[PDB]
Amino acid sequence: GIVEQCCTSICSLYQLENYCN
Amino acid sequence: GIVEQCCTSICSLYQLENYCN
Amino acid sequence: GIVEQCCTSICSLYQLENYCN
Amino acid sequence: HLYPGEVCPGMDIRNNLTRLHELENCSVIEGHLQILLMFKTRPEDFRDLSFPKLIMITDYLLLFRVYGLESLKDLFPNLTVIRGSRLFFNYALVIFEMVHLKELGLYNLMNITRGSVRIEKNNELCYLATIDWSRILDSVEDNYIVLNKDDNEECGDICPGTAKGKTNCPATVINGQFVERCWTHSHCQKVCPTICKSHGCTAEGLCCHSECLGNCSQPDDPTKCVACRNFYLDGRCVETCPPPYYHFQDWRCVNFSFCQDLHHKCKNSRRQGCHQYVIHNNKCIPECPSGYTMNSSNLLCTPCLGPCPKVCHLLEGEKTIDSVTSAQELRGCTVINGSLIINIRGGNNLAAELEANLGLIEEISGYLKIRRSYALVSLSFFRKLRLIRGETLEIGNYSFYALDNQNLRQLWDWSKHNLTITQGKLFFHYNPKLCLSEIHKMEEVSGTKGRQERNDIALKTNGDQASCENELLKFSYIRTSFDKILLRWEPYWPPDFRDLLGFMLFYKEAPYQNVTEFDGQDACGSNSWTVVDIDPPLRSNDPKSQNHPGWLMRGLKPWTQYAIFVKTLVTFSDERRTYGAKSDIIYVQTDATNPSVPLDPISVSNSSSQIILKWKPPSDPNGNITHYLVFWERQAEDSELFELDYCLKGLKLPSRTWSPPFESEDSQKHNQSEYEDSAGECCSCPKTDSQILKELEESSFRKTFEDYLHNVVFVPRPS
Amino acid sequence: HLYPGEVCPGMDIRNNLTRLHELENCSVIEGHLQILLMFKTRPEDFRDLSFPKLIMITDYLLLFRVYGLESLKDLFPNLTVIRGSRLFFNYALVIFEMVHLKELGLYNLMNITRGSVRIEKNNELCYLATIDWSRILDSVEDNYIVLNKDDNEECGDICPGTAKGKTNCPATVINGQFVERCWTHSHCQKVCPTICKSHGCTAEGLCCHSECLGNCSQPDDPTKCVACRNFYLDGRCVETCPPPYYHFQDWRCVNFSFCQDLHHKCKNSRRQGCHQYVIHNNKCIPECPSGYTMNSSNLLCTPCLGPCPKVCHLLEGEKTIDSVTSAQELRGCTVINGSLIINIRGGNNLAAELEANLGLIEEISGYLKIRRSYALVSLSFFRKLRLIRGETLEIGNYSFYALDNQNLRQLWDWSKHNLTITQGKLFFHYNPKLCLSEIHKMEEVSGTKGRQERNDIALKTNGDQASCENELLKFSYIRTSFDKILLRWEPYWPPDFRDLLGFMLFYKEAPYQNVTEFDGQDACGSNSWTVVDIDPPLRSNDPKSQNHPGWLMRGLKPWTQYAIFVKTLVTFSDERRTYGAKSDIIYVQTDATNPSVPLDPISVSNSSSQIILKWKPPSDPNGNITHYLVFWERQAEDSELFELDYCLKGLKLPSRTWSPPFESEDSQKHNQSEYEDSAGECCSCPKTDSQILKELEESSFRKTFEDYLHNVVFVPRPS
Amino acid sequence: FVNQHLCGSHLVEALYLVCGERGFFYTPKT
Amino acid sequence: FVNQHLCGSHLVEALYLVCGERGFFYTPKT
Amino acid sequence: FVNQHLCGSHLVEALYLVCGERGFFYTPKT
Amino acid sequence: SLGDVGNVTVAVPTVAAFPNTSSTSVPTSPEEHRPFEKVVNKESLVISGLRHFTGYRIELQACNQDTPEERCSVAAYVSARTMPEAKADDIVGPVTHEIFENNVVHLMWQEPKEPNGLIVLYEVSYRRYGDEELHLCVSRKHFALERGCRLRGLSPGNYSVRIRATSLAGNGSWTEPTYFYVTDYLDVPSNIAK
Amino acid sequence: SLGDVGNVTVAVPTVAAFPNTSSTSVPTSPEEHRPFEKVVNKESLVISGLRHFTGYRIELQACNQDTPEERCSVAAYVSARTMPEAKADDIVGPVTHEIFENNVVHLMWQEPKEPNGLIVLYEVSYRRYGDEELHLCVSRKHFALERGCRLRGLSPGNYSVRIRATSLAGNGSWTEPTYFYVTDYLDVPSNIAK
């Protein structure tokens, strides 16, 4: 889940841009 | 053994069972 | 509303902000 | 000196049938035989007792809580003199809180030069109606002879002179006639005259020498006295003792070794009471009151400038105080070198006295076993409590112990106090309703780690009702009024923007500037503090919000200081690191505002053209005040006064200071237009009928919904 | 055909317009239909097509974060039912975070097969309160339509009362409120008779017949009706389909060749994979139940000899069943190779569905974890649980982690219930209604005796309001009065008779019979709790008499169903076992008398010759018996009459007034203002501590003589 | 026992509840 | 008070306390 | 996102703004 | 209500422990001869045998005994004022008076048939240029003592009487605001009431 | 009506348009400078310049921010009555009488502003000797409209008066029923040093 990298320990750029173009 | 009150004082059965005429 | 959100409901300044902000 | 037999001091009797058979040689009693804790003594065993004879009686008599005693007439035969040297409640004799003293001795009493007799609660007691009245009592007014069987006109006053024996019974005069006065059924009293009662009388001649008293071998000689009202010593009598000998109640002189060095030798190895007996007030005493210290090498108590502290060494170094008066027992003792155990049961908020007393008790050198502190919810009310030593270690080698204690939720605060730890480990466990980091601060201030174990102290539970919030907050803005006050604080939220569910505002009336942090017992509305909840704010944009977290509060009176703060509605979890915060207690003063209305308006005067008005304030101590607006220009020249109360009516307007045109009474007390300002919180229920968890059950449920609605729609690929 | 063909499987509609082309001429859905993330789109954007072609949906319909599509009257107007075979979370209809809505279509829906609805976080749609949804659902409770714009004060959900076309809005009662059955304003939803609605009805003032459940296309026909109550074949409703056509997905009748081909294919773009369906008695189904294995001879389900259970592979990776949808993930499995966690909360006892899914597995590998259940009672979905392998346990060796199970006052009925613990220990904390003597029995039948930890886990934290004791007491004598009753129960004591400390009676005003113990958690009204200790003269049974152990109530209300149960004050051994007793939880009441005035004797007279009265119960019940007699004492020639003579000016409280207040809405209104200013009462009042212990100690004066005589007097002593 | 106002008419009940099988004392004894 | 509801002209005493000089256009209903 | 700890609908909105239209993927072939 | 101070019924309707008779004979019962009122499936019951324009107390109690009427001889007390109607707010008796045009009059508004508690009062202020003047306050005590009023100098003409409106629950005879004449007593002129 | 000056307790006379002028004898005015006093850190202020037992309503109010105006608190209405000078009720100003032509001596009570406080009534208990001329224990309104007091008829000889001025202090022109000499139904020198 996205929460597993953003509702928890630090949410960096790679934790977000994993499915964008 | 001349106690009469038992609300502000104490009593027992042997003081009252006699007074059951 | 303006006279039913705090009198006729639990008071909360959030709706009250809308009348001037 | 120069007496026969055993000159025996006194000792108590307790919790047995009879322990007088041991006495077979004591012919002089200098003490006073006390009776204590005789809740079940039967009369039949006291019919016969043992005592050889008596020369005199020195001290008072006190009888207390005895059930038997049909006869105490074998203990003191051949009586010569009785007086209360010491005085329990100022009386020579004190019969109180006992029952059924049918017969007693004392049947040849000659004089009681100081102290009257008080008798109380004697359902059976006879022959107190045929005895000398004024010849024996120095103070007749203080005589309290009451509640006796003969005094109820039920006991026939059988006495000698009719059918009993002869025991040297002269006929004395109290009512002109030489009456054959008696004391009991088969005894007669020898009584000296009232004229020379301060010198003593004897059958050997006239009134004894002035130094003698009661009886003497021969008159005109202090040596011949067997009992002297002046100081007796080594056979002779004298008016004052020599400086080598300290005094004893106008009656004896004793070497200083029996007061000074007698008790200094023993600290814990003598069963007599080692209190460092000193000399003051011209007499030897165990210890002197406060304001009188010890200065000399001989340890004689001498005055010091004003009140002074006392360093008290108690017997056994242990004293379990079980009441506020049990602590007042050691009042004045500013430092106690031992354990002061608290097992106090009962009471109601009298522990303010302890703040006067235990607020001076600094050190407790022994093991600290404290529990049952019902009165003080917080232990932050003692201004001198800093030292805790382990000179006496209880089981477990601990110097502190408070385990599974109830009716406590707080401890001593370090904002205005401190405490230090010494002599080994310490055990603190199982006192719920109190945060745990306060104990960590206790360890930090105490210092000397290694003897402060983080496994022998609670760091695992007992804090799941008062969450320890690491962060703290403030009031960035406060726009006040008479009661309507909008407080706005920082928009800081937890890392999760839904776990926080509002803010719990805490407030109360507190003009003082020193307050702890606690919460009284729970009875669905009743609490020392007052607490309420505020809805959470709303997010607007990522970098910052345009609406700070704000809240409007009412009910607070103007001019008044309130020790107010807030906490965060924190959802319980397994980690307190990410919880919210709490504001610091601020004694915020509601601004001096026009609804200030003084009360108790009293119009008094020393004249007619004056009115010295005085009052009391509800909550306005006038600190910020500048002036008082008061009216004396005529505003009662009303047509209602000029057009009312004809004499044809009954007298109702006379004796009044309230008339129609000055009325401001409510039309109806019912809540109609503006009386709804008193609409307050639930007081049948605390705030809501359903307790807190049912709300949390909803709150987290929504989270577990929304996140469950999120975890299915994201993460297209692990890659 | 009657039912149109061209079945279109479900897909995800996400992030772009013009993706609705897969709905062209589609009859029903086979899969999941989702409409997600359509942001910044005009209403005209998605109105390029409308789909009344759809009739019913096989599974959940999802709408999440769509700002266009202002209503459903122009995309899916005509729909009848929504299948509830598969569920999403508590329901099938998700409508979450919709914007720009003001109406709602879905014209003439009839019944949702299983679950509930959800229309939430939609502050834009109005007219969404009285919509016909209740009878359409099975779960009348567990409904979620909140965060609308009617409780938020932004629009009133009004619907028309008249017959909008063929439809009409009958005011139907749901939970006490009259809902106008509709879908939106200017439209209505019809209601048919109950018998008709049992099998559906047409919207033509006509009723269908059996074999149907909704609207019959050819009206009043059983064979050619839409929305069949059971399976269907080639456009005809059927209860059971003879061969070769077997059932499929519980609602269609499909050919054997179709099921064989489906087993020879997979719906994950592979072959010989997923969707493994095989024949049963009448139905193609995957994963035949226990006791029926596969048959490769013809690819069927055949009855195996002996048990042939099917285990669900959960060796690695936690998959907790915390929802009804998660419960349906494991249908008919027999062993959970992983660890099972239960966190379900709220609802209306959804465990029935667990009985339909769970309660069949018998080996729980690893560790069970029943955590944070705010509402869960009568555990009956692990009756078959009698085995555990314990392949991988949690930290602390606690494979039974029970916590926060507030109202979970039962485990089983102990009809051969048991469980064998290969490895691990038992954890129990905060279980207010979980019993002690039954937990001990569970310990005995799982090899946990002795190895239970007495350093981390306790028992007294639990049972704080209710428990059970195999030891029991009985009521051996009762004597009744109107305000008190002399009750006397059995003299039984635990095996250590001298460990007896005393009995403890717990009484409260439980509202009605058949209610369990609650005292211990409640400290205010609504189970107002009172407790009194008891210690009658008999402590041993040797001295017989006419007074066996018992107590009398200190005072109660006349004719009140007070609940009585007892728990003896007892010690506890090294390892806790069955200890403590009780009696039957008995609801008893006293006699009655009515000297107390019935409360609110409101003067409601309405005739000069006859008097109308209004009676409410007095503060005391004074007997539930309604029989009364009415008289009246005269009030003629009263002093008030001739003293309060009002024949002139001035208020005299004039005689003979009549003005009933009518507290509700006529005088003393209720705008949620509670306090009345006649005489206010404190809410956050002061508080003191407990003080009862000063009283019972008095009675010790009359129970300690024999104790001292046996313990202090008979000591061998040298005196 | 907790010290309530157990005197007065209660005394009669205190005189009765341990009796009735052996009569009872109608009036107060105080 | 703010415990459950405030109803009356006192809202004015609150209303002006909310906005302040920022181009306010609050609507006091009386 | 901005504090490295975001949890809510704001997370989804920011994620959508990061990618934009034709930003989300998935995998049918599984 | 109680015909006897004891706890038995005597069936003596002539004695009711009051000057007036309100109770009526019933069969003998083990309680006082009283107006028994049974209750069955209702919480309201009327009390007949009262006087018009009055208010009364009310007794109530429930006791176990139902084979007899009720053993209990005490009760709990409430209050209730009767609702006035158009039967006693007016003068229960007539509103006529004794006419005298012969230098003296006796004024007496007639007493009620059923004694009420409060009559509709009319003030009495007939003053002139410092001569024998009469006043009157109308209460039960005052009306009983003073016996109305008696004036002098009687002839058809004007007579001063104080004026004020009356409103208890709607009266039937009032005081008028007009300059009163004497036109042979239609309702108002001679007798101010009505 | 008449603005005043001063912020402390007054002692100088205040102009009242009367011969004898006393302070606190003026109607109120919108001007805020009243006879009030400023704070002395204590809830007690001796007040001077008042009148002997004059009735005074006061609205007790505290204040803050004295700079702009007397920004003060809401009003609590309390009436003051302290230390009556019943001695002073004898005379402040003189007393005279108009001998009306009805065998009545209308006693006119003069004053600068107050015969020992606020005139509210003059209690009179003279209604004996049957019915006689128009008697009034005159109230303050009729005193305003007549400036005196009416009584019953008075015959020659001795007459015990019962008129005492009642300014809530008493003892004005009467303390005990002393007999004045009524001469020819008139000429009663009342208030003989009383």
Residue numbers in the entry:
A (entry chain E), B (entry chain I), C (entry chain K): 1 to 21
D (entry chain C), E (entry chain A): 1 to 719
F (entry chain J), G (entry chain L), H (entry chain F): 1 to 30
I (entry chain B), J (entry chain D): 724 to 917
What did the article's authors report about this structure?
We then decided to reevaluate our cryo-EM dataset, which led to the identification of a second, minor 3D class with a potentially distinct ligand binding site occupancy (“intermediate state”). This small, but stable, 3D class of particles captures a distinct conformation of the receptor with at least two insulins bound to sites 1 and 2′, with the membrane proximal FnIII-3 domains remaining converged. The reconstruction is not as highly resolved compared with the four-insulin–bound state (5-Å global resolution estimate according to the 0.143 FSC cutoff criterion) and comprises merely 1.7% of the initial particles. Surprisingly, however, the domains in the receptor head lacking insulin are strikingly tilted. An additional density proximal to site 2 is consistent with a bound insulin in both size and shape, but is insufficiently resolved to exclude it being portions of the receptor (e.g., αCT peptide). As such, we cautiously assign the “intermediate state” reconstruction as a two- or three-insulin–bound structural intermediate. This second 3D reconstruction provides evidence that even at the saturating insulin concentration used here, the receptor adopts various liganded states. Furthermore, our intermediate state map demonstrates that a change in occupancy is concomitant with a conformational change.
The insulin receptor (IR) signaling system is a key regulator of metabolism and cellular growth. The IR is an extensively glycosylated disulfide-linked (αβ)2 homodimer with a modular domain structure. Each protomer consists of an extracellular ligand-binding α subunit and the membrane-spanning β subunit, which also harbors the intracellular kinase domain. Insulin binding to the ECD concomitantly elevates the receptor’s intrinsic tyrosine kinase activity before cellular signal transduction.
